[PDB]
Structures are given as structure tokens and as C-alpha cells.
Write an enzyme that holds these catalytic residues in place. Structure first.
Site, PDB file in Angstrom:
ATOM      1  N   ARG B  12       0.839  -0.996  -0.008  1.00  0.00           N
ATOM      2  CA  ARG B  12       0.091   0.009   0.052  1.00  0.00           C
ATOM      3  C   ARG B  12       1.092   1.130  -0.081  1.00  0.00           C
ATOM      4  NH1 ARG B  12      -0.680   4.716   2.227  1.00  0.00           N
ATOM      5  NH2 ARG B  12      -1.056   4.246   4.299  1.00  0.00           N
ATOM      6  N   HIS B  72      -6.896   0.051   2.300  1.00  0.00           N
ATOM      7  CA  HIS B  72      -6.970   1.253   2.838  1.00  0.00           C
ATOM      8  C   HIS B  72      -7.806   2.281   1.998  1.00  0.00           C
ATOM      9  CE1 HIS B  72      -4.896   5.550   3.163  1.00  0.00           C
ATOM     10  NE2 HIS B  72      -4.498   5.089   4.729  1.00  0.00           N
ATOM     11  N   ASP B  92      -9.446   0.061   6.413  1.00  0.00           N
ATOM     12  CA  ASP B  92      -8.898   1.160   7.121  1.00  0.00           C
ATOM     13  C   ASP B  92      -9.316   2.432   6.366  1.00  0.00           C
ATOM     14  OD1 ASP B  92      -7.321  -0.582   8.646  1.00  0.00           O
ATOM     15  OD2 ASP B  92      -5.516  -0.224   7.676  1.00  0.00           O
ATOM     16  N   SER B 129      -9.124   6.714  10.877  1.00  0.00           N
ATOM     17  CA  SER B 129      -8.034   7.617  11.001  1.00  0.00           C
ATOM     18  C   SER B 129      -8.376   8.928  10.193  1.00  0.00           C
ATOM     19  CB  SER B 129      -6.835   7.304  10.176  1.00  0.00           C
ATOM     20  OG  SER B 129      -6.018   6.151  11.017  1.00  0.00           O
ATOM     21  N   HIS B 286      37.008  -1.124  21.453  1.00  0.00           N
ATOM     22  CA  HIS B 286      36.002  -1.935  21.219  1.00  0.00           C
ATOM     23  C   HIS B 286      36.315  -3.306  20.703  1.00  0.00           C
ATOM     24  CE1 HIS B 286      32.946   1.507  20.354  1.00  0.00           C
ATOM     25  NE2 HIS B 286      33.932   1.997  20.675  1.00  0.00           N
TER      26      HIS B 286
END
Ligand SMILES: O=C(O)CCC(=O)C(=O)O
Ligand SMILES: O=C(O)CCC(=O)C(=O)O
Ligand SMILES: [Mg+2]
Ligand SMILES: [Mg+2]
Lengths: 314, 314
Positions: B12, B72, B92, B129, B286
Site C-alpha cells: 500500500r 486502505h 482502514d 483515521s 572496542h
């Protein structure tokens, strides 16, 4: 108030990048370009590393740059001597994670190295950091910082392993500010292992930090530290006047290309601002908004940073 | 408690990536690989986009995956009809930023689209949303979410332009949780324009969010959204048992290669976990620690994600 400066560490942290192999001339070119950009500090590998690191420090510190040149050493008397002799404008002490922890001793040992430097070079700026600051036991950390802070220009915090969270960084910087007072500056250095180097730098500033370490493209140990460009993108959206006043933002593409060229990497396709894809728009409902107003799906203008948007209409 | 699921949006949001051109077979391959990995949701382009988007939605939703397939759409009656007819397990809704703002109308219009879906497909999961959630006026936003929430399974927040800050995200998610109650799920979608997509997703979860949108390598509009790998690196350091139980983490390299191959990009040199450089160590102090304990400068073990460290001893 939100005043802060950048300490570029491309010639220190960035040297620890897997593919970094900077000639003295590479370093000079980077330093001059950062100075033109407006960067306030340029941090360089410890002179104690090799005869060539010493020479590079000596040269960079004597370039006559507007930026202060500072070197990063272990908190030892040995290395302090070497450091002041190089002519650097600042020394960034790191007290390494050894360390159990005997605190007035640690305080004594730090204050001594700091005292020598004040003696031998009273105009040099001194910063004190304990390594792995966010994972140290907090009472002892604050105890050391509080005692050392009257003697230094700056204290730093280092998210060495890149696991600190933004709210942890905010909280610890606030506590450090509380115990060191308003005068001592506060520096944040953060690795990007968990994708939080930029977010953390920003929260550090909101909490009262005055200095943020960046490297161009974020080069450093492992996946590196807070990248210059992503950091400026973050700050620009919040303080656009301030950021554009401070720096020659349109130079960002060339800084990123220069370092990519030298270390033999491609600029990530999604790299902040300068990545192939940073300003590409595709969704129909996005494109139809960009024609009425380019701002509608843009966080910041591409021309500000010397780049252009792409529209994918087909 | 820190329970959450990932909604992958590679099929998407990732389609909105500049160089994305997924064949039906590309999508099926991605979806199957995500399902094997353990991803809980797979979100797909609106069926209304083209006859091919519809077909792809229809196929993906019928693959018999364990993951729920969700689409969506704009919050419209038009698109709702098309959406349920595709057989998706979730829809959605996005109420786009138009919008001045007349709130009980907005509430009416949303509740209507939602009501049709309950009528026509009572087992489909509905998320609501509002676009550009973090930049909407907050009283009106919360007013809409509070009224819509009894009718939906989930509400989402979208940092559409990639400018939200971690503490802003934390705060707004907390306020949304307060008004929607403990039952309604909360989803976060964030762009990476300011380098905060991972940090924000994490703060969203700390504030009570239950679902995070990712795409493989973070592909999407512009520099994209929260990347799957960087998100897992972030979560793994905090909930290692939970994350390793949920997902086949050793599959990450192949997911990243697959998508890089398909969209024609190189995996960034500093890409989380799978980047050329993600586990490279160079500094002497290190390396001397990695021999006594590999953990000393490693946020997480490379074998967990199916990769290896590099030591640069020369
Ligand atoms: O002294 C510092 O702030 C940084 C040293 C360093 O590279 C680290 O601790 O990650
Ligand atoms: O509905 C969503 O959460 C995301 C839609 C989107 O791409 C955005 O607002 O950035
Ligand atoms: Mg470091
Ligand atoms: Mg989006």
C-alpha cells in the site's frame, strides 16, 4: 531556550567507520568544507592513536578555521599531555566503562587530568564524559558529573551501544542539567542501532543539551551516529530561522557526496534530504495537492537544501 | 502492557514509493514471505485505484494467509462498497484533511460509511483515521475520535508529513487512549522525513498504541515510513522474548533483499541489522572488549537476525 551547536565527528567517530581511510588531505578537505558550512566544532581522532593521527590533529587544529578543533581522548594523564601539545582548541575526555565503582577515586582521577590541562593550556575547552552514560547506575553517574562539572566547560552523555530511548534521554539530560547547573554545557552523542540517534539528539536539546555530535551521512562504528543531514532536517522543521541563519544549508548535497565518494558508499536511496527519493511524490491525492501548494506534503522546501522534488504522475 | 502488532504496508504505502512497480506475483511473493515471518496484518492499495489494484486486493485477501489482509480507502460510501466486495478482512478508513471544520457533520459522514460496512460485512475489522493527525486542532480531533470510537475496532494517527516529535506522539496517543477507552485499538503510521519514524512508533506504543505500520526497508512516499527492520531492532532491545516469539527474525535479510531487488535499490550501507555496516567494529578499545564479550558494543546479537559481525583489526 533552544540554542545549541553541532560537534562534527566525521574525523573521529567517522574514522571508526568500516570503510573510512582518510588521508591528511581528505581530512583537510572535510574540515574546510564543514567550516564553510558553519559547523561550530570539529572533533578529531586521539593524537595517541598513531604518529599520523597526531600529525592530522596538529594540522587540523592549525588550519585557521572558524570552527574549534577538539580531540577525543581517554581520561588519562598520558594522553592529556599529547593532546595539549597538538594545539587543539578543546579536549573531550572520555572516562571509559572501567569502571566495582569507587566514586571519590573516579572523581580524583578525573579532576587530576582536568587540572593538568588547566595548568598547561588554560584556554583549552575541557569536556568530561563517562562512557555508556545511559546504562551507568544513575546515582553514581550524577555524583561524578556533579563533582567534575565546576571544573569543566561541558559534560557529555554517550549512547554508546545505540539503545537509549527518547524519553530516557530527555529524563537523564534533565537530571544532569539539574546537578551541573545552567553554566556547564551539555553534549549528546548517540549511536543509531535502534533508529533513535536523531530523535534522541532532539529530545536531548529539549531537555537542555547545548551540543549534538553528528557525522556526515552518520558514518561511525557499526551503523554510526546522528547524521548531519537528518539532524538538520529535524531541527529545521522546528527552528527554521535559526537553522538557516547558522549554516549554509544548500551545501548539504556536496557534503554528503564528498564523504560518500571518500568512503566508497552510495548515498542511501532514502537518505534524508539528499537521498534519491527524499522528495518524491506519487499518490494521486498528494500530487493534486502539490499543484495548489507544494507544502501540502512537504516537511521542508527542497531548494533550501539545494535539491528538487520529483513528481511521479504516470 | 506492551502488546502490539505490526501492520505491513509494503503493498500500500510501499506502492507509493517512487520506484515501486509490483506485479500481482511480486505482491503475492511479498505477502507470503511476510506471512511466513509472522506479520499480523498486510495492508493493500485501495481497490478503487485501478482494475488491477482491485484484482490484487481480491487475490491477496483470498490467499488463505494467517495475516489479516486489509485495505486502505478514503472514508467514502463509494469506496466502502468496492472494499467489502473484495473480501478483505479489514478496512482502514482515512478521513482526508478536507476538513472549515464542522464536527457533528464529519462525525455523521464517518459513522455512515462505518454503518454500511457493519451492515454489509459484520465480520470485517474497521479502522478510522483522520489524515495529518498530529497537526489537526486537538479538541476537534479528539471530539471526532471519541464519537467514532464506539463504532470501530481501531483508530489511527498518521504523521503524514513526517514532522511529529517523539514527545508530541506520546502525548497525543495518551489523550486518544483516554477518550476512546481501553477496548478500541490504536494504530500509528509515521513518515521518516525528520528521522523520527522509529522513535515515534516506539513512543506511540509506550503511550498505549497497539498497532504500528511498517514497510520493508521503509519504502513509501518520499523517504518513506517506519522500516520493519529498524522497528524490530528497536523493539527487540526492549522486549527480546516477545519479539523473537512473534516473528521469524532470521528471515529479515531475505525480506530486505527481496524488496530491494524488486524496487531496484541497494540496501543502505548503514541499514538497520542488514546493512553492509550494521555490525562492523574498528576501534581498538572496542575490539579488545568484543573478544572478552561480543555483547560489550553490540545492541543485539547478529545471529538472531541471521547476519554476522565484522572486525576491522587492521
Ligand atoms: O565521548 C563521547 O561522547 C563518545 C565516545 C563514543 O564513541 C561512544 O561512547 O559511543
Ligand atoms: O491512514 C493512514 O494511517 C496512513 C495514510 C497515509 O499514508 C498518511 O497519512 O501518511
Ligand atoms: Mg561513538
Ligand atoms: Mg503515509
Amino acid at each position: 531556550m533552544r540554542e545549541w551547536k553541532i560537534i562534527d565527528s566525521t574525523l573521529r567517530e567517522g574514522e571508526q567507520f568500516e570503510k573510512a581511510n582518510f588521508s591528511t588531505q581528505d581530512k583537510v578537505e572535510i574540515a574546510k568544507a564543514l567550516d564553510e558550512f558553519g559547523i561550530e566544532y570539529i572533533e578529531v581522532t586521539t593524537p595517541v592513536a598513531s604518529p599520523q593521527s597526531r600529525k592530522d590533529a596538529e594540522v587540523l587544529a592549525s588550519l585557521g578555521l572558524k570552527a574549534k578543533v577538539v580531540t577525543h581522548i581517554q581520561c588519562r594523564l598520558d594522553a592529556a599531555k599529547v593532546a595539549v601539545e597538538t594545539g587543539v582548541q578543546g579536549i573531550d575526555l572520555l572516562f571509559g566503562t572501567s569502571k566495582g565503582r569507587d566514586i571519590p577515586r573516579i572523581i580524583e582521577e578525573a579532576k587530576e587530568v582536568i587540572a593538568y590541562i588547566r595548568e598547561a593550556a588554560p584556554h583549552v575547552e575541557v569536556r568530561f564524559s563517562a562512557e555508556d552514560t545511559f546504562r551507568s547506575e544513575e546515582q553514581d553517574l550524577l555524583a561524578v558529573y556533579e563533582a567534575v562539572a565546576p571544573y569543566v566547560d561541558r559534560v557529555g552523555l554517550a549512547d554508546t551501544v545505540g539503545v537509549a530511548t527518547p524519553r530516557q534521554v530527555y529524563a537523564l539530560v534533565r537530571e544532569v542539567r539539574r546537578v551541573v547547573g545552567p553554566r556547564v554545557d551539555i553534549e549528546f552523542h548517540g549511536h543509531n542501532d535502534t533508529g533513535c540517534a536523531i530523535a534522541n539528539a532532539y529530545e536531548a536539546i529539549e531537555a537542555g543539551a547545548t551540543h549534538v555530535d553528528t557525522t556526515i551521512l552518520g558514518i561511525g562504528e557499526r551503523n554510526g551516529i546522528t547524521p548531519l543531514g537528518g539532524f538538520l532536517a529535524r531541527m529545521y522543521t522546528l527552528q527554521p530561522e535559526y537553522v538557516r541563519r547558522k549554516y549554509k544549508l544548500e551545501m548539504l548535497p556536496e557534503l554528503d557526496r564528498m564523504v560518500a565518494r571518500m568512503v566508497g558508499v552510495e548515498i542511501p536511496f532514502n537518505n534524508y534530504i539528499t537521498g534519491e527519493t527524499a522528495f518524491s511524490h506519487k499518490a494521486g491525492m498528494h500530487l493534486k495537492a502539490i499543484y495548489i501548494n507544494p507544502e501540502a506534503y512537504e516537511p521542508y522546501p527542497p531548494e533550501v537544501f539545494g535539491v528538487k522534488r520529483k513528481l511521479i504522475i504516470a
